[PDB]
Amino acid sequence: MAKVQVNNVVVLDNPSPFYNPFQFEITFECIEDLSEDLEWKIIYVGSAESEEYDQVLDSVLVGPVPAGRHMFVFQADAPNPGLIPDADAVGVTVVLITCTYRGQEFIRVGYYVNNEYTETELRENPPVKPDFSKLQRNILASNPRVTRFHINWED
């Protein structure tokens, strides 16, 4: 039934400065010569309080997909700090990697991300306004969350 199956996601360049682009090595399997494109997205949760502060870092259309095992590195630019509420800038947040077929999301891989200052003085006495040039992004890559959804694969 499910034409596409995500086998693995590897977090590359981690930890890294806040401004470095995200890099995930994704491996997936395709059952047939999939008729429509697969739409991969990297979504950054800018604020746990509201979905309005989500930033879609990149949206990619992969296809035609021939039947078989495939692997690619999904790279996406770091979020725009100008849209992140200061209260949510430092500490834990989530980055999501989703895939969508025919406008239906079928997989969501989430990673908890902890943004922290690297200097001891800044860790103990954080600036009034976050300094994204001094933040390090530490993705909690040993604990990924995978959620699969039932979609209509028929054409």
Binding site: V45, A48, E51, D88, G91, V92, R108, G110, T147
Partner: peptide, 11 residues
């Protein structure tokens, strides 16, 4: 409440 909200987002 931040952890509960973030957990709902991943689900």
């Amino acid at each position: 409440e931040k952890a509960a909200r973030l957990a709902r987002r991943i689900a």
